[PDB]
């Protein structure tokens, strides 16, 4: 057998564990017969990850009990012997064996990764890189793997070159999820904000705009459009004019539903040239794709683009007198678009009136003005 071999390999830790008096022979034979039964259950014919989990629970609890009897009997923390790292070495062996014998359960993979991230003070990040790279190899599709240990590599070690490297590798591996693109934009903005805060810390002790996020936004837009189209039309390129045009309208709808989420959790981020990259988004959504949709379908979408382009300024201030001061720009563009629209003019009027109602003295008189007087007086 090999169960005899694993049990015989775990004997010197109990040897010095009885040689130092913190475990007598009766209870160490008790834990050894319990580990014998657990290990045969582990190396059965058709075992289970539940068996791996509860054997790991047994080893962690006997490690906690060994530390407790060490701080109670010998009154020292580290016994500088074989008795200390042996249980963590065995837990590492059990997690490696479980990830070899059962590689499809991310609950067990995540328990291994959390245990190793906790024991990073004793065994450093090379084992983290090894088991995470083999996890990436065995599951390239599941984007939460890339997102999780990119968060690890950014929040525990903060190595931005390798972080952007694994985001670009995962984005090459599956450029048809929205979540990976959007959280790559989120990480890229976190890096650019930390860099500008480094520059501000330099200025405190006394070029690099959002073009990275805008280029990956553009590649996000065209690639998610193409792969949404290929998620539809499964095997045969559907060939009739109205069906092709209506599916182009459908992917325009889904793509703009992604772009508005970009605008949402960028407006939550802003702290930067926010109007610059928001106007880059809206210049792209002025220069449309497959249909040039301003006079074509989705006129409510065209109204929402006009509404964002008008209300670009108003979304930032609690001191609304500055909004009234610069509102000549907003109402000037508003008149420039009311002069172009007719019933979308009416819906845009209701939208701008609701925005000013959500908003609410010399400028409130001179530079609607009824609400400006009602908020000034």
């Amino acid at each position: 057998s090999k169960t005899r071999y694993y049990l015989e390999q775990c004997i010197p830790e109990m040897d010095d564990l009885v040689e130092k008096g913190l475990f007598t022979k009766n209870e160490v034979s008790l834990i050894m017969k319990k580990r014998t039964d657990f290990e045969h259950r582990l190396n059965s014919r058709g075992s289970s990850i539940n068996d791996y989990i509860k054997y790991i629970n047994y080893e962690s609890n006997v490690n906690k009990l060994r530390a407790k009897r060490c701080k109670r009997i010998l009154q020292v923390k580290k016994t500088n012997s074989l008795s200390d790292w042996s249980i963590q070495q065995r837990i590492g062996f059990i997690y490696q064996r479980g990830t070899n014998k059962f590689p499809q359960d991310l609950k067990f993979w995540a328990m291994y990764l959390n245990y190793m991230k906790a024991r990073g003070n004793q065994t450093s990040y090379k084992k983290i890189h090894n088991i995470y790279n083999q996890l990436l190899k065995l599951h390239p599709t599941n984007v939460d793997i890339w997102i999780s240990c990119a968060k690890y590599e950014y929040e525990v070690h903060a190595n931005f070159k390798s972080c952007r490297n694994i985001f670009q590798n995962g984005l090459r591996f599956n450029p048809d999820v929205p979540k990976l693109w959007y959280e790559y934009v989120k990480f890229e903005l976190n890096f650019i904000t930390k860099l500008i805060n480094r520059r501000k810390v330099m200025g405190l002790i006394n070029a690099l705009r959002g073009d990275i996020a805008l280029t990956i936004f553009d590649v996000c837009m065209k690639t998610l459009g193409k792969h949404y189209i290929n998620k539809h039309k499964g095997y045969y390129a559907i060939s009739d004019s109205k069906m092709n045009i209506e599916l182009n309208k459908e992917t325009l709808n889904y793509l703009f539903s992604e772009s508005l989420r970009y605008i949402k959790l960028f407006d939550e981020f802003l702290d930067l040239e926010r109007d610059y990259l928001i106007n880059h988004v809206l210049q792209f959504w002025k220069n449309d794709m497959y249909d040039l949709s301003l006079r074509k379908d989705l006129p409510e979408l065209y109204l929402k683009t006009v509404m964002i382009d008008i209300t670009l300024n108003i979304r930032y201030m609690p001191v609304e007198k500055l909004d009234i001061d610069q509102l000549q720009l907003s109402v000037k563009k508003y008149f420039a678009y009311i002069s172009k629209l007719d019933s979308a003019s009416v819906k845009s009027l209701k939208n701008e009136y609701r925005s000013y109602l959500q908003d609410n003295k010399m400028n409130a008189e001179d530079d609607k003005i009824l609400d400006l007087i009602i908020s000034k007086l």
């Binding site: 057998s1 090999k2 169960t3 039964d37 059965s44 014919r45 075992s47």
Partner: protein, 461 residues
């Protein structure tokens, strides 16, 4: 009063479910395991009987053989399953031994082919394209040494220059070659040994002692710049290309046919000559053949070391091949078949498990070296059983009945009768030597390991 009694408890011994494996509880007491030595003895005897039951050494031919018996075989050294055979009516062939077929054939020369070897020949005006085509060169007795390419699908990198890359031509005839495995140099033998490289049509150097022909050569396998040869002055010569000169010369009592270096010692070689024993020399003290493998009945036509560095394959002029170990001096075991005659070239493969023998009937047969170890990848308990009972046979090989089971073969009747009369002749001549030593007083106890040397230039240092 405190009592207790053992508790079987029927759960840590028989399982809870059905599918998991029951316990094998274990107590290593010499009380509970009484007969140690007799039981492992009987396991050794069953090991010997099962080895004789599975002693099935022959694995296959390859192709339909050549025309008229091989006379040169060259294994390559980078790859495993590629092997060149040159045979008598000027026919060289380059076998893929995996499917056991030939890549290409060539009418290579007119007369007898004499020796071939493969090279990865680094030209200077060309990249070595040695991952898509493979190069072998062959010398015959009609004064030509041809170097050939071979198209080979070992890889699939590319997509045409099939044969006869060039032809070195010599003054006299040629008797053998081998290629220096570094820097694209190769040496030949003929009237006198010559050293070419593949950027010249003329010989770069000439390296004889005197005007005496040279039957065979061999380079090293490491410390590559020295080499050895054998000429029909019954002589072993060494040479060193770093000094670019011959360096020492011994003369034995009969002509050495085939020499072969050791690919793990780098200063030991075996030497196969016409008296029926392969000597095994140390280089830096050539006064004593530090072993002599002494079991044939006829001329010892070829030898080679296995690349593991301890087994010798030999093939005799009588129709038999033998495998020796280095550390013993007698035969481990013997192959033979009715349909092979006069095995002229034997070579270990680089896998160190398969010996390629080439007879004079035309075929290039193959054999397993260990005649019972199979080639499949085995499960770990089976590998444990095989290595354990093999270690038992190795530990108990001196017991008389498992010795008389592990020793005997079906040696063919020719070899058995002729070895029997050779044995009674040797016993008779030892008896007459004992009578003569009973009389005389100045008679040296002549050592068997120095019996065959009858002269050494650079006598002693």
């Amino acid at each position: 009063m405190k009592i207790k009694t053992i508790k079987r408890s029927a759960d840590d011994y028989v399982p809870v479910k059905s599918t998991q494996e029951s316990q094998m509880p274990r107590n290593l007491n010499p009380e509970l395991h009484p007969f140690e030595r007799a039981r492992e003895y009987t396991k050794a005897l069953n090991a010997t009987k099962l080895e004789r039951m599975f002693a099935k050494p022959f694995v296959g031919q390859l192709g339909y053989g050549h025309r008229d018996g091989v006379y040169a075989i060259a294994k390559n050294y980078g790859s495993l399953n590629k092997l060149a055979t040159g045979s008598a009516d000027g026919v060289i062939k380059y076998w893929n031994m995996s499917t056991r077929e030939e890549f290409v054939s060539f009418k290579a020369h007119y007369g007898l082919v004499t020796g071939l070897c493969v090279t990865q020949p680094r030209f200077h005006d060309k990249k070595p394209d040695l991952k898509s085509q493979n190069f072998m060169l062959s010398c015959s007795d009609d004064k030509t040494v041809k170097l050939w390419s071979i198209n080979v699908d070992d890889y699939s990198n590319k997509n045409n220059e099939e044969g006869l890359i060039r032809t070195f031509d010599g003054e006299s005839a040629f008797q053998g070659i081998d290629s220096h495995r570094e820097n694209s140099t190769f040496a030949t033998g003929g009237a006198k040994i010559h050293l070419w490289d593949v950027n010249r049509l003329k010989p770069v150097s000439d390296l004889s002692w005197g005007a005496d022909n040279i039957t065979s050569l061999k380079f090293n396998q490491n410390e590559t710049d020295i080499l050895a040869s054998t000429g029909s002055d019954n002589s072993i010569v060494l040479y060193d290309l770093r000094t670019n000169s011959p360096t020492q010369k011994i003369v034995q009592t009969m002509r050495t046919n085939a020499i072969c270096w050791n690919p793990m010692e780098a200063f030991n070689f075996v030497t196969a000559n016409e008296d029926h024993n392969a000597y095994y020399y140390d280089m830096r003290n050539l006064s004593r053949s530090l072993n002599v493998f002494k079991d044939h009945v006829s001329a010892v036509m070829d030898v080679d070391f296995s690349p593991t560095g301890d087994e010798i394959v030999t093939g005799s002029y009588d129709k038999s091949i033998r495998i020796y170990k280095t550390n013993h001096g007698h035969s481990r075991e013997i192959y033979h078949t009715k349909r092979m005659q006069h095995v002229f070239q034997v070579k270990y493969s680089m896998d160190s498990k398969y010996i390629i023998s080439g007879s004079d009937d035309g075929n290039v047969r193959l054999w397993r070296s260990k005649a019972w170890e199979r080639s499949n990848v085995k499960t770990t308990r089976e590998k444990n059983k095989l290595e354990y009972d093999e270690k038992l046979k190795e530990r108990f090989r001196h017991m008389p009945e498992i010795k008389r089971i592990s020793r005997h073969r079906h040696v063919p009747q020719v070899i058995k009768k002729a070895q029997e009369i050779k044995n009674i002749e040797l016993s008779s001549i030892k008896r007459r030597e004992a009578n003569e030593r009973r009389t005389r007083k100045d008679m040296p106890y002549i050592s068997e390991r120095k019996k065959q040397i009858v002269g050494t230039v650079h006598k002693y240092e």
